[PDB]
Design a binder for this molecule. Structure first.
Ligand SMILES: Clc1ccc2nnnn2n1
Length: 165
C-alpha cells in the first residue's frame, strides 16, 4: 500500500512524489485528478495523469462531457482510473488564475469524503494559482476520510511540512 508518507493528522498524510508514479506503484482504489469543468486534461496534474493513460482518460472524459455537460467548480465526477487506479475522482478546485471563488476550495475537498481512501494532489495548487499552504489547511479541516497527498515539488513539500500547524 502507501509507503513513505509523513502523517500530518489522524487522516491526512503527505509525500514528496509524482502522483503518476505514485498511482502506478500503489494502484489505489481512487486517484484524484485536479480537473477543470470541461475535463480538458491539458497540463499540471491532469495533463500528467492523462498522458500516463495514453489519452484514454481524455477520450473517456470527452464522452462524459458530451453526455453530461461540464462539472461545477467545486464539483466532481467518478470515472475510470485506467492503468493508474480503480477509479479517478475528477475534482474541480477553483482556478484563481481564471478569477474563480477561492471559497469553493472547501466544497471541492468535500468530494473526497465520499471515498474511504484516496491518493490526491493539493486542490487548486500549481497551475490553478491558489496558495498550497492554504489548500493543505482546507484539506485537513475538510477531509475526514484517509487522504494521501502527493506533492510533486520537493521545495514546496518542505515548505508545507515545516509550516504545518
Ligand atoms: Cl509531469 C507532472 C507530474 C506530476 C505533476 N504534478 N504537477 N504537475 N505535474 N507534472
Amino acid at each position: 500500500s502507501f509507503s513513505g508518507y509523513l502523517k500530518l493528522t489522524d487522516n491526512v498524510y503527505i509525500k514528496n512524489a509524482d502522483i503518476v508514479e505514485e498511482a502506478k506503484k500503489v494502484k489505489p482504489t481512487v486517484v484524484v485528478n485536479a480537473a477543470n469543468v470541461y475535463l480538458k486534461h491539458g497540463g499540471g496534474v491532469a495533463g500528467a495523469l492523462n498522458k500516463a493513460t495514453n489519452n484514454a482518460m481524455q477520450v473517456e472524459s470527452d464522452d462524459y462531457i458530451a453526455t453530461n455537460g461540464p462539472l461545477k467548480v467545486g464539483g466532481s465526477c467518478v470515472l475510470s482510473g485506467h492503468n493508474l487506479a480503480k477509479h479517478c475522482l475528477h475534482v474541480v478546485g477553483p482556478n484563481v488564475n481564471k478569477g474563480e471563488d477561492i471559497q469553493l476550495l472547501k466544497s471541492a475537498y468535500e468530494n473526497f469524503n465520499q471515498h474511504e481512501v484516496l491518493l490526491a494532489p493539493l486542490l487548486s495548487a500549481g497551475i490553478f494559482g491558489a496558495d498550497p499552504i492554504h489548500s493543505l489547511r482546507v484539506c485537513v479541516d475538510t477531509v475526514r476520510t484517509n487522504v494521501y497527498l502527493a506533492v510533486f515539488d520537493k521545495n514546496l513539500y518542505d515548505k508545507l511540512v515545516s509550516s504545518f500547524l
